[PDB]
């Protein structure tokens, strides 16, 4: 089913909590906040949860435990190998 | 990677809980009804072992203890910490 306005106003909650911990907090937590700020900015274009690369639902289960993904998991793997060329 | 009569085991011992929870049957138990029905459902989709939030490999002894594991213990925490936010 199609995530609420209140499920999404969380998901905006929790991200803008990991955007402000790595402030107190090198070459992984960068590519982390990329990662936070492209979920956000996926909230603001009403996108959030759908696959930045395939258009498909992302999982809500992974959602929940990674507020973060913006990519479906088979998406993420098509991903970190179009960075190593 | 599991082999078809692993896996048709796991559906086996899976639909034997659903039965056996539909006799006995708690917030408790509403959530493992959930799992088990999951874990039914990643049989059909062929993802059975793999884990719903990262993809990776549920381990071996994971499942044969917990065959309605449908993520990695890792994730699990991730998930569970998820759904307390709100």
Redesign the interface.
């Known amino acids: 089913m199609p995530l609420t306005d209140?499920e999404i106003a969380?998901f905006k909650?929790?991200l803008l909590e990991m955007k402000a911990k790595l402030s107190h907090t090198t070459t992984k937590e960068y590519k982390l906040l990329r990662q936070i700020d492209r979920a956000l900015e996926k909230i603001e274009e009403a996108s959030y949860g759908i696959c930045d690369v395939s258009g498909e639902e992302i999982?809500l289960?992974?959602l929940?435990?990674?507020?973060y993904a913006t990519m479906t998991?088979?998406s993420?793997?098509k991903f970190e190998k179009g960075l190593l060329s």
């Open positions: 209140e969380n909650t929790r999982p289960a992974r929940m435990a990674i507020p998991v088979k993420q793997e």
